[model samples]
Target: AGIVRPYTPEDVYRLRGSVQIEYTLARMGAERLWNLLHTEPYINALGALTGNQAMQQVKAGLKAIYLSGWQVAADANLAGQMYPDQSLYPANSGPQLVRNINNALRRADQIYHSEGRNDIYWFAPIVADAEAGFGGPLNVFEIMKAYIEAGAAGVHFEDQLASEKKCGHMGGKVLIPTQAAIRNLVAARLAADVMGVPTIIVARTDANAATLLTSDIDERDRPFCTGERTSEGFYRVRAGLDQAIARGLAYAPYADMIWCETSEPNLEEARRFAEAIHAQFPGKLLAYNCSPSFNWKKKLDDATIAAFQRELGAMGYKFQFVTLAGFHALNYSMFELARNYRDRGMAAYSELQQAEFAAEAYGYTATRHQREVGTGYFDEVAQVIAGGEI
Candidate 1:
């Protein structure tokens, strides 16, 4: 007879507890579990590519996919938020954003449920947009429920324009006060707890407030319209973190994970800053964002990228691939082409020919032209570039 594993209620409970313990341990030992927290090959949420792009990428052996609110907003063509008009949103109400989110979630659900695999995970920027209704605990609960229903593994609440006033009027705007934000977070935690979903708090202190309290940099010289001139900016971020931690601790039974985003341009600085915050509240989920320029400009050569990967692997810090769309896409493709030429019997000319074929298939005439005309365009590129294939 074939081996049989009998199932009992106790066995079920124990299995559930083990799963919970793994998750808890991962959060508790984030520095030890960082590598497992993120998809090995990261994917960015950009443009109007429906969740189909994410599904396709996961199918292509990618680990995770990001659902950027800015991208969603852009997909809808709206404006007046992070990334400015460069990534606009639809000129409509909050429904468009919600619809976009729902659509992404539906796709994520299909990918996960149909495949019976956990290779794909969905991450969304739970922005407190002016048009969206995610401003308070009630609204946050509603929106989060929608995300949970859509089969999101985790969700990020960005503290971009969250303040104590309703609007930046004479009295200042605080729709979601520091305490209110904490309460709302608690509510979200409880909701996730009930639904067996993980919550990621993506504190956007650096972007919202620029004072020393929030950011390590001083943006006093920058223009005021950018919202980086006030001393309160830094303090606000610190305060928000403090509140988030307090809520997490006091309501640990409700919350699952705590995350922070350090917009530091340098990886070392960003790591130190994240370490400092992680020290304040131990056993919380932590992730660092590094744009392509930051990693590339740091002069991290192939050896450096490998070393950084190893270092981050040891520290259990998962690096989010920012600016992964656009130029990065083409750059990634070229890097892959170079790698194949070196590792396999793929000749440079043959690889270029194949790339041209792919470019044409994707209707990327300009990229095909660049590859054809540019010198040193495929200069000694490395194989296995970051975030998998191009």
Candidate 2:
């Protein structure tokens, strides 16, 4: 009792722009909390995009996951619109994303309440989170401010022109001019400024996957292009590697690092892209979306786990996100488990026996879920109604 500092939830959120308040302290009585060590790996499961998913993911891996608003509900597409009504999904819209930032923070808070680890970080979708209801346009700073207020430690924004945006790898993609994208980044940095939240701003470019005319790349990025696209006005060797380098260079002055998103992670194209960006913008860090890309992975000969890291790291790409890769492994593996379960039926099902023997070994821990999600300590600070079993 004497060892742990005594502070309450109200005591934390009572002050602040808004933090999980799920943190520690050393200060005057009036002082409350601060957002600390930030991280989370992107993973979608029965838990994520649904109940209990958040805590499960927290227990899984707290790496820096590059998830986006377009993907807030990862299972939605195949699962068929988990919440067809956007009203239920606040993160999908402006007012709601703001309303739901706590939905995100609460998940992390559950972990903080339990594990006392300040290391888990999650990045909210700034630009995509910037989208919403009806036909209204979003004020980039307002959306940025909303996410910060929602307790975001980091944010990822892109240069796509999204009246409604598509997945980065998909074609027929539209782009905002590089300058427009930069302005949004600058505005976001300013919001982080006035609010004083130590939010990380990640500037991403979808230019490589964008639909472009040859004329678009010929003038500015001819040095990096392989040749013309197979079809007219389309990008050859896929979309915007050169344009990404160009934007990465322009965005370097304002962003902490630039995220180079492409249709595929081609080592040759990636090397050329990196060499170009590094030659000009030497100090800027690069974050690559090694998103779960079935198409690219199946084709790349150098897709070995060890080589991907060594090859990409050599080209100055410091941060890599394995959002899709993590889930796909779970996807098929879980699929097979279900088939075996149905085949055997309840009385004869064999996996449960395997789990009973090795469950503890496989997971962080069974009780680790609640023991680490620490609800007891904080509940002690309350009355029967507030944090009690009554």
Which prediction has the highest TM-score against the true structure? 2
lDDT at 247, model 1: 30
Q: Give the Å error, residue 275, model 2.
A: 2.3
TM-score of 2: 0.63
Per-residue error at 254 for model 1, in Å? 7.5
lDDT of 2 by residue, 84-168 (tens): 2222344434334333433654655654655565664423222223322212223666766666564444566776654535566
List the global CA lDDT of all models: 0.40, 0.50
The alpha-carbon deviation from the true structure for residue 373 of candidate 2, after best TM-score superposition, in angstroms, is 5.8
Backbone clash numbers for all candidates listed: 15, 14
Clash count, predicted structure 2: 14
Return the lDDT, model 2, position 124. Answer: 25
Off by over 4 Å in 2: 1-61, 73-138, 213-238, 295-297, 300-303, 325-334, 347-359, 367-390
Candidate 2, residue 196: lDDT: 50
- Model 1: how far residue 389 lies from native, Å: 48
**Per-residue alpha-carbon lDDT of model 1 for 1-390, expressed as tens digits?**
111112334543543334442233113222222344554432223322244444344444444444444444433334544332111343232334434544554445543454465644533322222222344566666655555444344455543333221211112221233333445555555554544444343332222222223332333312222344354553333223333333333323233333343333345654554465456555444444444435463666677665554454344344343423533454566787777867875576586776657856643333434332222222322322443755
